[PDB]
Ligand SMILES: *[C@@H]1O[C@H](CO)[C@@H](O[C@@H]2O[C@H](CO)[C@@H](O[C@@H]3O[C@H](CO[C@H]4O[C@H](CO)[C@@H](O)[C@H](O[C@H]5O[C@H](CO)[C@@H](O)[C@H](O)[C@@H]5O)[C@@H]4O)[C@@H](O)[C@H](O[C@H]4O[C@H](CO)[C@@H](O)[C@H](O)[C@@H]4O)[C@@H]3O)[C@H](O)[C@H]2NC(C)=O)[C@H](O)[C@H]1NC(C)=O
Ligand SMILES: *[C@@H]1O[C@H](CO)[C@@H](O[C@@H]2O[C@H](CO)[C@@H](O)[C@H](O)[C@H]2NC(C)=O)[C@H](O[C@@H]2O[C@@H](C)[C@@H](O)[C@@H](O)[C@@H]2O)[C@H]1NC(C)=O
């Protein structure tokens with residue numbers, strides 16, 4: 001339980017003993033590029049640090065063992081971070097994403113706590129024994145803010161201040177400390193931001209700050225030092241170490257800095273996912289981002305109705321609620337060029353085409369159970385899942401076919417081949433037994449319909465098209481939707497091809513995807529880097545959903561599957577007995593068909609070779 | 611090489 005001073009500099013985290021004169025050592029870390037923000041857990045002597053250049057948060061024991069990345073995705077500049085040693089939680093702030101997030105100390109159950117009207121949150125301090133967290137905001141109007149450790153009742157504590165750093169709590173004396181990088185002061189106040197006092201005014205460049213016993217410790221970037229002085233008088237100064245340029249953070253490794261108790265410490269509040277300290281009532285139960293807290297206030301429920309949108313190297317999820325929950329990146333590894341996404345509502349699994357690997361991959365939203373459904377002259381261009389028959393209908397840019405594969409990877413076969421066919425975008429309609437696709441023949445783009453076995457093929461549209469690259473449909477309204485990236489517009493029509501109408505053609509730069517959510521049609525504008533939606537009832541206006549999203553690739557809405565309605569489909573029960581293709585006719589009855597390389601047997605159910 | 615720079619929105623390499 002010796003007192004240690006830890007500081008971050010360059011790619012190292014180094015250690016200074018505060019009790020023995022003879023002690024300077026580097027923590028044996030591997031693979032760190034820029035060690036910024038430091039904290040620790042008194043429970044297990046683990047140290048935590050963020051990396052501005054790696055855009056990660058990591059942890060390890062002080063002897064360098066059990067190096068672990070706990071946060072990897074969705075970080076831009078994680079300059080603030082703090083361990084909740086009572087609730088066993090990890091808080092951090094990102095000045096790039098303008099977010100303050102929480103997760104378990106192993107990174108599980110990541111949730112966003114502050115995301116609105118937040119400009120450059122940088123320095124974070126936690127008081128779990130009281131239920132408050134404090135942070136500094138940079139930006140146009142810098143301030144020191146306060147909130148509960150669940151993000152609620154956010155308030156501005158100290159409005160007149162420059163860019164403050166090294167926000168530190170003196171738990172014994174109930175005082176806040178910080179450096180001001182604009183006034184070049186070290187200041188102190190009470191927990192309410194009152195009784196403000198300048199502790200040191202003669203420092204040329206104070207940056208980092210911490211407190212131990214009757215001393216405060218700071219770093220000066222002009223003096224290249226870690227220095228220490230009386231926390232009350234500012235005197236009794238001593239230089240802990242010099243010739244240390246650009247120390248990012250200092251931290252006191254001692255149990256006195258992590259003491260006290262709250263309800264989360266004794267029982268985790270019995271919460272399933274997150275126990276968050278709050279001032280009044282002690283604690284509330286939290287949930288991972290987009291999850292719902294149940295009626296018991298103890299257990300969480302994952303969203304069943306959400307919006308997925310993908311970039312070149314990311315697949316994101318957002319919900320449509322009224323607290324305007326933020327969009328999150330799904331922690332999915334090895335994404336290189338995502339060009340199309342889909343979702344299976346039955347097994348709750350995410351599907352996408354990566355055209356760098358020329359594969360159809362599938363995973364869960366946590367990135368687990370990664371599976372390759374289609375692999376190597378294979379060039380998947382678009383995909384659409386038949387959720388009842390458990391097939392993927394996907395287009396192949398190399399062989400110019402429409403191929404069908406089951407979700408587990410077993411090949412059904414090709415249902416469309418053609419000399420001059422260029423099948424690119426595709427949406428299935430298993431409810432009516434048809435599929436819709438674009439034919440990007442040079443000098444004659446087309447939107448076509450066919451049955452899910454290739455028969456009954458007809459051209460619905462062959463004019464007023466330049467590059468129809470995205471398709472959507474809705475079986476209840478009987479409507480088909482598409483976006484033309486060259487004509488820069490979105491159209492719709494009946495599934496029969498009647499009532500073709502232009503939905504939107506103004507202020508669209510390059511629409512490359514679209515999807516339908518109830519009465520709302522969403523699309524992504526790659527060049528304009530935004531998501532937009534229009535109310536198809538005409539009631540509400542065209543709304544900008546999110547902007548500044550680069551490399552947009554696809555967008556896909558997911559509605560909670562109604563299992564009673566699902567099992568009412570005849571092809572959901574043993575494919576209707578069909579070996580390969582189960583089809584729905586106008587009679588609502590089931591018929592079986594085959595891929596192009598098989599023929600239907602006299603069993604009226606099974607496919608065989610010619 | 612990079613030197614840390616205090617900006618309006620945080621510390622950045624510049
Ligand atoms: C860092 O710097 C600080 C500030 O300079 C140092 O703290 C000061 O230490 C001196 C010397 O010990 C203290 O002077 C003594 O004060 C007592 C009582 O003073 C009362 O009134 C003060 C003025 O308002 C007030 O600040 C005091 O508050 C302290 O104590 C209360 C009580 O628990 C506590 O709650 C607070 O948080 C403060 O800690 C207090 O109410 C006075 O009686 C002393 O007289 C004795 O000593 C003299 C000479 O030794 C002797 O002649 C007398 O006969 C008598 O025996 C003495 O004046 C000063 O009060 C401290 N100030 C603060 C704010 O704490 C600190 O020591 C430095 N740290 C180091 C050196 O490591
Ligand atoms: C979970 O927290 C809820 C906070 O809103 C509690 O709901 C509130 O319960 C009140 C009764 O104590 C009730 O009058 C309020 O309408 C309601 N608040 C709403 C709906 O916003 C809930 O408390 C439970 O209430 C009923 C349902 C019983 O089950 C009681 O035993 C509970 O205290 C909390 N549920 C828990 C703690 O299981």
Ligand SMILES: *[C@@H]1O[C@H](CO[C@@H]2O[C@@H](C)[C@@H](O)[C@@H](O)[C@@H]2O)[C@@H](O[C@@H]2O[C@H](CO)[C@@H](O)[C@H](O)[C@H]2NC(C)=O)[C@H](O)[C@H]1NC(C)=O
Pocket residue numbers: 235236
């Ligand atoms: C920490 O410093 C205090 C204060 O030092 C005094 O004030 C400074 C501005 C500087 O001028 C010092 O040289 C002064 O001595 C020390 O407390 C003082 O100790 C002297 C020595 O007898 C005494 O005469 C004063 O009354 C004390 N002042 C107060 C406010 O208590 C203190 O001893 C130093 N701590 C250590 C561990 O050395």
Ligand SMILES: *[C@@H]1O[C@H](CO)[C@@H](O)[C@H](O)[C@H]1NC(C)=O
Pocket residue numbers: 061063065
């Ligand atoms: C490092 O610390 C951990 C945690 O106490 C311990 O299990 C391990 O034996 C220590 N030594 C090494 C070499 O990992």
Ligand SMILES: *[C@@H]1O[C@H](CO)[C@@H](O)[C@H](O)[C@H]1NC(C)=O
Pocket residue numbers: 374396399401403404405410411412413414
């Ligand atoms: C269709 O896909 C299967 C594997 O999914 C593959 O074996 C077959 O060759 C494909 N047919 C083509 C590309 O024409």
Ligand SMILES: [Ca+2]
Pocket residue numbers: 166167168209210250251
């Ligand atoms: Ca600190």
Ligand SMILES: [Ca+2]
Pocket residue numbers: 382383384426427471
């Ligand atoms: Ca599609």
Ligand SMILES: [Ca+2]
Pocket residue numbers: 471472513514515554555556
């Ligand atoms: Ca889509």
